[PDB]
Symmetry: C5
Subunit: 211 residues, 5 copies
């Protein structure tokens, strides 16, 4: 219990030492790794061509300014902190139709090597024609995710896998998933020498009664 | 009276003028539910809406005091924004949870905190069967979003959901409501991830 | 200009209370004025009310001598500037919506009056609203966290004020009462007073 | 560059506990009605969009322009100043603010504030589908001040319909904003309001 | 180490630039007026409600202006020529839809790009409900609606509102929207309002569309 007291003291000192980053630049680029876990397709609205998804969006990056030596802080190897306490990337859906609704606490995990893990659960409405959702072939919709203001020369956007994690998809959803991918795409624009990356979520789905 | 007030302002000042738990400073959080109403069961989207009181209790050595040194004050009320609170989250919500009560906690001199938010939650639930004798069954998990069992050790006092305040004229009657202390582990690793699973069997009244 | 300085002074003095305790308990008087039953939803058994909730209490720490401040006997101030009681509907189904400014009137004897207008959705079965006898619903109001030993809840009348009820509402009011009750809840050892709004209404 | 420093200097020098019987204020109010959006006969609520012009004058906001680079006015966040607690007395939802919360202060101490708002209020739309139309009314005034602290004025008793949406679902037959001063038998204080009265019908 | 040092130095230089600009603007005036250039990119007509004559649009609103107080010499800051910053860190113009029927909803991060010549570019994505009769949307001719954008409180003598083109950018319009765009323009106008003595400029978005 005294050991509990010391651990708490060492964490307070670590946080003070770390917290008491202006974002990436061409000279100091940052890798941001993204992955999606799709939990539910809640609603597919054919009157407005909007579909509503619930997913967990895993984001990971590493900063030198968040590094420490566990030995100088009682072997603390990671801690939790408010996502407001730190810089976070401006990763955005490019075709949402409503402000995204955040479903989880905005808290990140920081590890002694300076890596940050942040996994917000989100409900998103996005542009999607659900024609065919009541057929055996199903509907197909897609939404791109990427930085709002940074090129690939500033935020190098990566994934760990092309596959959307479906292991938590709600088994009694109104919609069954036929496939879900998160392929990465690059676009070269006329205006800029820089490349712009996105991760596109592509979901093929149908009414559970359509099969 | 003026004295008891200055003792309390002094206590608060002394206490308030916690970085959360860690593997070496783990915290036990006890959870229990009072189910007040099933408001809405939407078969077009498979979402159900519940209203419940979520009782949370934990203890911090940093919130301990001697009542004798503070005018025999044994507890006080404080804004939940004034203290650390655990990040207990429904794991299958479909809308942000709506808070229905004041965000005020009770702190007792042994360092124990009691916090009981009333909430409305929309969560994933197929109500097929609700219009039958057998009813429908749904489940939702509650737990920390970011802490494993090494940091927040989640407990229950009972597995019996409190139904004594359940709305007697709800559109839905409760056949049973149980709160289970569950966990999952990856065999590769020591970390365990606990949750309280709220399981509710219900039908059209 | 002198009056302005006197008021600025008085407010500085007063603002530059940790809430009630068992050793320093507080009386809060509640009264309701019902303006409108807006909506009765039989699909979810929720009814929507618009009402004003009059709250009154008195603190020694808010007292002053008017002669020491230019004969100022009361002032208006943001309800955020002072402590306010945590009076809550116990069976709301949506967060309560405030429809008026949150401004309290403080009087030199330390008494405070605060009267927010609110729209509330709450648990209510409207069966019978399309009949002569109507529907009856009830909602309790009280402190969320303070027991009877910390906040004593009083009323000035057992009848809800209907003198401002909207005369072209979809619903007419047959009766509306606001009796006091005391209840032990399973979570806790202490007894909690409330004011129960009971309303009978029909289309 | 100099004009910026003077403006920053003005604001610093300037930056009020509200009016009193000894220090009273007059608020001039007027409405510009843009749209009747929805008339809901299942709940007897009607939804309006309007601009609410508010004007008042504080001695504590006066300055000599010659002491500040000939500056005669400035824009500021409505949160940087005291604003009157003018409220609809029969709303059924919180008002939604549709414009930036910015006021203009002028060197005579006058403030102008014109929030665009969507308001749901209590209104039975029976008759809207007829030649005569429906009529509804909502009173505006201070929530906590009497006429001895805040008096109300209007520049006109006719609602400005010059911005009313021509292809609204509802056409306006008339719209007035008469000011009333009520003395209740109980009390010395006078209670002013401005009542928005609108007669309207489904556009044909 | 050199590479890591070089990253440290570019971070320091950016942090220092932001401190010099921010930690050491009150808006335009008749004596110090500001040009604001606007342009719209229309992404989707989501919904047309004939029961209330409200239509819902998703668009990106490009705003550009230039401040002397935001200038710097890149040679004085490690050759930094532009940077990204929260739009809360700088003054932004009070550009408003004049006939919205609900508060505008912001769909993107609110981050501006500031360039060493003092120019600012800010491009929020928004969902807007505005006054619009969709009668005729179910016909070959379609419906036509308009909405004005401009400053709420600054007259033409304070903010001079310009465009780069009379044409709304449709190159990102959602190909499977419920509604097809027939034309979309953004002409400038100058208007006298009853409340006020001054002339106020607007940019009017006029959109012709059909099912
Ligand atoms: C033990 C007590 C001092 O602390 C509390 C903290 N939060 C809520 C409560 N309560 C008590 C009972 C209840 C149920 C309805 C409102 N209320 C008084 C919630 C109590
Ligand atoms: C008189 C001016 C200096 O102060 C103001 C304050 N608020 C709004 C406004 N206006 C001016 C006209 C109007 C109507 C539409 C938006 N706009 C420019 C509202 C003006
Ligand atoms: Mg020790
Ligand atoms: Mg170096």
């Amino acid at each position: 219990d005294d050991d509990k007291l010391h651990s708490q003291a060492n964490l307070m000192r670590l946080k003070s030492d770390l917290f008491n980053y202006p974002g990436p630049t061409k000279d100091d680029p940052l890798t941001v790794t993204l992955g999606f876990t799709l939990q539910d397709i809640v609603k597919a609205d054919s009157s407005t061509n909007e579909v509503d998804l619930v997913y967990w969006e895993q984001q990971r990056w590493k900063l030198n300014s968040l590094m420490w030596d566990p030995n100088e802080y009682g072997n603390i190897t990671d801690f939790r902190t408010s996502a407001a306490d730190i810089w976070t990337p401006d990763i955005t859906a490019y075709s949402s139709t409503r402000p995204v609704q955040v479903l989880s606490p905005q808290i990140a995990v920081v590890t002694h090597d300076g890596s940050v893990m942040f996994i917000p659960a989100q409900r998103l409405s996005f542009m999607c024609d659900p024609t065919g959702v009541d057929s055996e072939e199903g509907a197909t919709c897609a939404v791109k995710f990427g930085s709002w203001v940074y090129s690939g020369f500033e935020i190098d956007l990566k994934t760990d896998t092309d596959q959307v994690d479906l292991s938590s998809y709600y088994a009694s959803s109104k919609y069954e998933i036929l496939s879900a991918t998160q392929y990465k795409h690059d676009i070269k624009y006329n205006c800029c020498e820089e490349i712009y990356p996105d991760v596109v979520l592509v979901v093929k789905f149908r009414e559970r009664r359509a099969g």
